[PDB]
């Protein structure tokens, strides 16, 4: 029963309203959260899952909890419209994992990007080097739309996991409609 707590970051935006992935991108994002929460529950019952929108407002939608019932309710009525603000959300997610009293549980972040982020690449790279010092694994699955090639995120992931680091997989949105199961397989195959 490996102990891990994951502060996932969901996305709610006009981009998320687009339904190219599955019937709706938001529904597909909810499905992706459902599998990861189930996977954490299979790995350990005590595992804590918490999520928050990284768009416009980046607070805590749900405090990390072993029970997944709160996670499902937060996914319901997510309401999408805010422009993505990944930099504020990523900083909040890393510190929030430290905030949890049970720091013994392994700390991981899974995020969904629905829109291009208007941030200096150096600024996110500086956050990524700080994230590397924090040594908390972050894997991001881009959903529906993303900055072309997620170039800033690819550099951010490399800065986050450089020098033979975890190299947590970064999933650029598959072009056009993507099956949720196709999205789920890459994180299950490797972090």
């Amino acid at each position: 029963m490996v102990l891990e707590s994951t502060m996932v970051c969901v996305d709610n935006s006009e981009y998320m309203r687009n339904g190219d992935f599955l019937p709706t991108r938001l529904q597909a994002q909810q499905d992706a959260v459902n599998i990861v929460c189930h996977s954490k529950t299979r790995s350990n019952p005590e595992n804590n899952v918490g999520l928050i929108t990284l768009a416009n407002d980046c607070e805590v939608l749900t405090t990390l909890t072993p029970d997944t019932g709160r996670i499902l309710s937060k996914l319901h009525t997510v309401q999408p419209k805010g422009k993505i603000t990944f930099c504020t959300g990523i900083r909040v997610a890393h510190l929030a994992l430290k905030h949890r009293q049970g720091k013994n549980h392994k700390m991981r972040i899974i995020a969904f990007v629905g829109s291009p982020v208007e941030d200096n690449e150096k600024d996110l790279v500086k956050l990524a080097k700080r994230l590397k010092k924090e040594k908390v694994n972050v894997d991001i699955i881009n959903f529906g739309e993303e900055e072309v090639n997620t170039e800033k995120l690819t550099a951010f992931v490399n800065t986050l996991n450089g020098k033979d680091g975890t190299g947590s997989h970064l999933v650029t949105v598959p072009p056009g409609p993507s099956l949720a199961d196709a999205l789920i397989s890459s994180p299950i195959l490797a972090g």
């Binding site: 607070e59 805590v60 405090t63 504020t88 900083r91 909040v92 510190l95 905030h99």
Partner: protein, 286 residues
């Protein structure tokens, strides 16, 4: 709403005890706790309160975390102790209000329909009262300021408790008319002369400083409207207040005289009582 914000003494101490509890880390530079109080009437009275763990970050004041579980579990257990007790707002230290306060306020607004922020200062100074009351609302300014969403100051008061200063006031206290007009006048001159001047001085500095850093010298109607209300008296030259002559000046003499004439009669009673006390009672050679 929030016509007045009485804060119970027990809550006022509770903020200070929390600051000592987190005194080990001075990085936070403020103490944040859920403020629980009863909306019995328009008057808001704060009662027993608990402090939610919170971190404020200098990085754009966007890295702010409030634990949903701590706020929900503690409030429910505290509500079980008092049915009257309900979330009524939140309390923070850090006398200068941080920009992050409005974002924290939005979460506070969600928890309580008409919540309030009390900026209690754990380190007390002089003048006024420790708690500062602010309520954040969204509206369209009549003149036309964009957004017009800001905290609004509200009147604040101290709550009533029994057997509370036996721990503290018993050592000192001065409950008598002996010090009235002996030191009480000194305190008012000490603060109205200096503290009242300091706020006016801030506006006089603002004539250029508000242009330099302030919202505007010509801004916030009450800057001129309230100042003009304060200038109910003209402020300069003829005045027509103490220079009334036939009016206030003549009255001042009548009352001062009526008050003074008692003192000549007063001296008579005190002097003769001393003469009997020493001239006869002391003089008992026997």
């Amino acid at each position: 709403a929030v016509q007045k914000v009485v804060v119970h003494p027990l809550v006022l101490l509770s903020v200070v005890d929390h600051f000592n509890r987190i005194g080990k880390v001075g990085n936070q530079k403020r103490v944040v706790g859920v403020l629980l109080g009863s909306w019995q009437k328009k008057v808001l009275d704060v009662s027993n309160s608990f402090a939610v763990p919170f971190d404020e970050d200098d990085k754009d004041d966007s890295v702010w975390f409030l634990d949903h579980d701590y706020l929900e579990n503690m409030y429910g257990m505290f509500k079980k102790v008092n049915a009257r007790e309900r979330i009524v707002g939140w309390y923070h230290t850090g006398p200068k209000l941080h920009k992050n306060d409005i974002a924290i306020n939005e979460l506070m607004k969600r928890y309580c329909p008409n919540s309030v922020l009390v900026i209690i200062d754990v380190k007390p100074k002089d003048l006024g009262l420790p708690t500062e009351a602010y309520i954040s609302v969204e509206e369209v300014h009549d003149d036309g300021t964009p957004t017009s969403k800001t905290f609004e100051h509200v009147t604040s008061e101290i709550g009533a408790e029994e057997a509370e200063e036996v721990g503290v006031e018993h050592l000192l206290r001065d409950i008598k008319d002996t010090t009235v007009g002996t030191l009480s006048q000194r305190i008012t001159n000490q603060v109205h002369g200096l503290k009242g001047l300091n706020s006016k001085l801030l506006d006089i500095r603002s004539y250029l400083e508000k242009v330099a850093t302030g919202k505007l010298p010509i801004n916030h109607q009450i800057i001129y409207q309230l100042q003009d209300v304060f200038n109910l008296l003209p402020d300069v030259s003829l005045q027509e207040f103490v220079k009334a002559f036939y009016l206030k000046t003549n009255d001042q003499m009548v009352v001062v005289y009526l008050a003074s004439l008692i003192r000549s009669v007063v001296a008579l009673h005190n002097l003769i009582n001393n003469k009997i006390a020493n001239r006869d009672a002391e003089k008992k050679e026997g």
